[PDB]
Paper text:
Nonhomologous end joining ([name]) is dependent on several canonical proteins, namely, the heterodimer [name]/80 (Ku), the large [name] ([name]), [name] ([name]), [name] ([name]), and [name]-like factor ([name]). Following a DSB, the first [name] protein that binds the break site is Ku, where it rapidly recruits [name] to form the DNA-PK complex or holoenzyme.
We collected cryo-EM data of a complex of DNA-PK, [name], [name], and [name]. Within this dimer, density corresponding to the C-terminal P-KBM of [name] is observed, engaged within the vWA of [name] in an open conformation in agreement with our studies using Ku in isolation. We therefore conclude that the density central to the DNA-PK dimer corresponds to the head and coiled-coil domains of [name]. Although the density is of low resolution in this region, we were able to dock the head and coiled-coil domains of [name] using the ADM_EM program and perform a full exhaustive rigid body search to optimally fit the [name] homodimer. In the absence of [name], we did not observe any cryo-EM particles resembling the [name]-mediated DNA-PK dimer reported recently. This indicates that [name] cannot structurally substitute for [name] to allow the formation of this dimeric form. Upon [name] removal, [name]-mediated DNA-PK dimer can evolve into the [name]-mediated short-range synaptic complex that has been previously reported.
Numbering used by the authors:
A (entry chain M): 180 to 202
B (entry chain S): 2308 to 2429
C (entry chain S): 123 to 253, 259 to 349, 356 to 397, 407 to 486
D (entry chain T): 32 to 223, 229 to 538
E (entry chain L): 6 to 170, 181 to 544
Amino acid sequence: CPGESLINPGFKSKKPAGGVDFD
Amino acid sequence: SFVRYKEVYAAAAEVLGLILRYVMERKNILEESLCELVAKQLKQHQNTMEDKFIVCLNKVTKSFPPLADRFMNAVFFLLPKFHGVLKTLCLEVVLCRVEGMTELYFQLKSKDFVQVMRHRDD
Amino acid sequence: CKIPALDLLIKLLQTFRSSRLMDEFKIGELFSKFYGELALKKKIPDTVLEKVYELLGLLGEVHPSEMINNAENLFRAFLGELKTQMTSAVREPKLPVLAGCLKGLSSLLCNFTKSMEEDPQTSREIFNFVLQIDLKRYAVPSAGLRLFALHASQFSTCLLDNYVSLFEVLLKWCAHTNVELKKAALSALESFLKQVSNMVAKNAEMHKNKLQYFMEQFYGIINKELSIAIRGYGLFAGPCKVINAKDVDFMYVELIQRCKQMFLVYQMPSFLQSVASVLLYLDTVPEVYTPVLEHLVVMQIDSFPQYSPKMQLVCCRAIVKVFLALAAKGPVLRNCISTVVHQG
Amino acid sequence: YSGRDSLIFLVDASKAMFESQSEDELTPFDMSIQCIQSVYISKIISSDRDLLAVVFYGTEKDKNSVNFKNIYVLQELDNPGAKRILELDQFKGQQGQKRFQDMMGHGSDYSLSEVLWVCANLFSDVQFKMSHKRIMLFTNEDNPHGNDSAKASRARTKAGDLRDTGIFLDLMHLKKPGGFDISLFYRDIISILRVHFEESSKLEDLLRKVRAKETRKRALSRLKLKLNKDIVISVGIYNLVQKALKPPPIKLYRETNEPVKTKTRTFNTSTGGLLLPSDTKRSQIYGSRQIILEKEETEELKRFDDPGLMLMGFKPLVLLKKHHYLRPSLFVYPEESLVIGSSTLFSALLIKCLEKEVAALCRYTPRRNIPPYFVALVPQEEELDDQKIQVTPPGFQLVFLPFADDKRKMPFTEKIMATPEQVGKMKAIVEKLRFTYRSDSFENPVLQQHFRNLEALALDLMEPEQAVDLTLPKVEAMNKRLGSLVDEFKELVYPPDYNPEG
Amino acid sequence: NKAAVVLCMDVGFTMSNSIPGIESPFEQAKKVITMFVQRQVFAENKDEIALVLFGTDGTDNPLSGGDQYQNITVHRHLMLPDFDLLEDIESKIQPGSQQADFLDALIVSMDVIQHETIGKKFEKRHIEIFTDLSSRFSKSQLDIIIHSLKKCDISLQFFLPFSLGGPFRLGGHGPSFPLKGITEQQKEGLEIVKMVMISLEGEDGLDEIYSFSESLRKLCVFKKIERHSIHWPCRLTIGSNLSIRIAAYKSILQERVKKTWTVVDAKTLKKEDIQKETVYCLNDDDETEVLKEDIIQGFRYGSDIVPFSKVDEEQMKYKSEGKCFSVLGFCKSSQVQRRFFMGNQVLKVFAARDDEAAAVALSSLIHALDDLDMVAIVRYAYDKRANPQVGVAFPHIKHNYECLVYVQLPFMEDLRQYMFSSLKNSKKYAPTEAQLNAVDALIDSMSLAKKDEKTDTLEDLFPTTKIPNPRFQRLFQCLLHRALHPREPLPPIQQHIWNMLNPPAEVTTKSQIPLSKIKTLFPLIEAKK
DNA sequence: GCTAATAAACTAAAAACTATTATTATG
DNA sequence: TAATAATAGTTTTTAGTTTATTGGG
């Protein structure tokens, strides 16, 4: 299922912390 | 499906297993759709609970062996989980499966028969 | 601490009940250690784990002064625990096992302590009065009944009040389900009746309670309830010897009439105990009744079978009591015993 | 409470995973090794209450209770432990793999029916409440059963049976120079178009260490809100945000390492004899007079109303001060366990209050002998993201209203203005420093460092991992982007001689 | 520091009487003074308290020179209160029969203050007077009294049996007394005191005259004898080239009892005779005692437990470098919801006092952040041993000053996820139109907000934020009952505590019918408790 | 130039949450 | 003669301590 963590079923897929950008 | 008191679904399993044994008195087969219906009812909300499931499955296999093939792995999967008479119950589910002689030795030894047979449950 | 702890403690209990007075004398130090371990502030031990009180309830030893000193501490602890448990003001009437444990310890301890000689005797007695529904089991009500039955003598001069309420609550308790509760209530009721009979016998105000409590129920009674009233009349025939003694044998006379209806099937032992009591209080007996009572008692002996063991024991006790009663009259003694053994 | 998660790892014991076209990159065996280390560390951190197992196939030898050749269980289904981690790490590396090949076979044939049998048996051994049965395979070839048509047929039959029995098989792409070749033998056999010369499907997150407790769904308390006195509705109260705290330590012996229990006793001083709670008297000395009371009165003085909620009224959301915050809010959801039909009325009231933009103020009693506070129930409409998954639950936000004595008085502060050009300087500085914030952007570095140290000492590492703190501002970049603006505004406001520091 | 507070209570007979169904103004005044003094004693404030009574049958004050300041009996001089003061208020205070001018009592009280403020210092000089204005007064010393108060800076607050500006609820919402029953003596006294304190203070004079019942649910009685919150002397920082000294304040802070429950003996009532210890004995080996320091803490690690001393962690702890307040960035105010405001207190931060450059900078920041609908992300650190935390800083502007408000923000660890069902999509729980209309009618009949006449302003029928927490009131009531009667059961919760606890009964009367509609239109079933 | 609370971390402690298990009921 | 029903067993706060630590004078 999209947007789910394959590591832990029933939990959203985790993305690495994005920090901060500049616009 | 109404699991509140045991007589309800027990007698439901009784009548339906008798029907499946004596549907058209074993002279014709087109009510196999009803067999699919009862198998689904078994799958629907009973494999998630699997305590009245095993009871009704036991009764219906006592009344109709050839259905239990739909749950062989299932009835194997649930084997070690129980520890009381439930185990006992599942045991005779195997008894009806003379047609199940494909392979059971490896199943039962992997199911660790030796303890339950060694245990004194006459 | 789990079900294994439960079973080990009950094993220890039944061990003391079985094994006692031979060599089980390494327990006083164990008693003190148990007192300390229960006094531990960490109250993880569940209500089911409260049978420690039954543990601390001890009768297998002579109970030297160490347990005597611990006894008062235990008793005040029980008073506090009961006050905490009973009060529904804290919305915590939960006493699923605690109250029965306090019952057991009090039963096993009061056998040698705390007679009717001081104030706190009534205090704990008050905790007995508060004894509505106990979830189809009724453990603690029967417990309180048994505890009162064991030490009813320890509550005298303070149970005289509320007499009618105690009487009716005993009646309802023995008139419920859970036949164990019924028999415990019967035991407590008969102990209470014995105590009140002794008190009014020694009371100079026996007329007060007589006109206030006894004659009312006695006339109002007319199942074992009738036999309960037969006990009541038989025991209260005593105090009537103090005041209006001329009526005493009079009731005895109508008692004869009663066994006339009985003559032509569990009330006979009650008849025997009642007539034994009245004859103990009686001095002059109508000799016309001597062959009559002879016939009645030998018919009772004939009716000894058809009985369960329990009222076989009851009837043999009543027979012993009537023999003790007739023992007071020499010629009556000899002739009645000869005739009864012959006919039997 | 619901079921748990069961994970199975099944690596091929062959030559493919011990070799790579570019030895500078990680061998499939070894990279799977760091993968399982990372997932086991994450599991230890998060859900160590579940079951994990290790098993290999294709090995020359074998070891399994099922006694299937080339099938060797390495670890049974168990909670992860540092012993498992080291047992796996000793085979890690381009020398650990050689060791493995030394005292452990690899490269022999196998049967997927056999591995399905053994994994089904292992799952069947678990007698606990399970909910997830995920099996991860580690190979880069769809051919080995395509070689034998009967083998492929029985393998896919058993795979279908297993997936019908609630078993979920998921595919781990492995780096095959000739291509993983999906859609040829797998999507028809796995429970669910690039041929995947590579391996990274989501192995990046698998290798990603995650530090989170992730407590399962639970109910704090199912209070029963009374409207006036009798029309009462069952509701569920949760905390979608709740402070994560360090687990308490474990008192143990410094000569045997076993946990030593502690027992605590209240007792006398003149005698020292052990005493009872009946001997304990609550005391409080005010001025010179001591007032004596007991505990029961102490909690009864805190007992006013039954555990529940008592409506005070309705108030528009504008009538609450933004700075008026006392304690982190809660979430309220309809509940139909005690009161059935309350979901319809909850929907009706949510619609009506959303239309009327009025929150519901109530008197809240958490439990017995507890103070009833004032709680504002703001409507919280459900929000769905692009993939229509709930990012905002539907229900109510229960915030707390501080009392008059819950607010402190301050010395009076006057109003001093600023020139609009200084405001423009501030706006330019902010724009040079602007970004978009998300709730999943900043963690607690203290806890992360504590963790990293904990695993490092558990793994007996010579050095612990350093936690990356995102709360440290990059002063050099900020200064680079500002430049003139800082001292320009300083000269605008602060006198040249009067620096902010005296 | 110390507050020189004195209470001037009229012992007149006029307020000793009241309308039936309404408690006597003397009695309600006694209730208010009892709660005031119980707060004073039970908070153990170091503020001296004096009691002066006028309208008494006798006369007792240093200014009694014959026909001067008569009917004035000074009960207590300026010292710290005690339980004796409480019992004298409860019992020794009785309704008298005489009446006297309240200006004479004011002069006597101020003279007593001057005679007793000497020998020490006082942070504040204050006085409150309870009266019904039905006693005749001579408006002669008003100018002298006003001048003396201005030259000595004594604060005043007045309270009345009737409302300042049908149903009657003492200490609760609803009318306290109809305004058409005030005597012309009361009206003239009201005008005189209005002009006196309007001249004394300015325009906020009417804000210090109140009623008893409304003061029972408000801190207005303690509003002039409180203590300021201490500042947090630190420095906000932007990058490595900008920093401003700050003075933060916990504007909102949860309150706790400052007096713990000490344990004493059941017989000697002594803590000394009942002391404490703990024992670390082995779980096995007949409970062999592990030595007190031989225990070392460990930690759960998955399926394993590792021994791990505190020294190890303190030498590997992620240290926080002192007290610092570093801004981490800026985001839109719409990106934050009220459900993410963490922490148990609110920091209404300020810059360094008397730093006009800092004031200009913070005002510029407030304007820039407000005009852009914009908020800041800042990092907090109380000190070296503190735990660094993230929080949100958003502007807050008052009519007299602008300000910035800090509330701590959560991390990912604090976050939890619980999935739900779309109730709006629940076909089995769609509300019927009649039920929706009944719900709407109930909401209209239940709302505590009324659109003010001829204005767009909105009023509140239940000002919760101006009401204290009622644990302390019942706590002190039972404490004083036990102190005076340590043989009797605790007194139940007083009725006025319910009056402040309950909303106005008018809203209940409006909701009477729609509540019936709701209960008739909804088939709600229950279960066994 | 003379000592002074303080929130953090630490406990106890109390309740809610699934999860079972004697118990009559009937014979 | 065999079915149901409170019921104790793991988490999780949270009230009352306990630590020294900055802040001054």
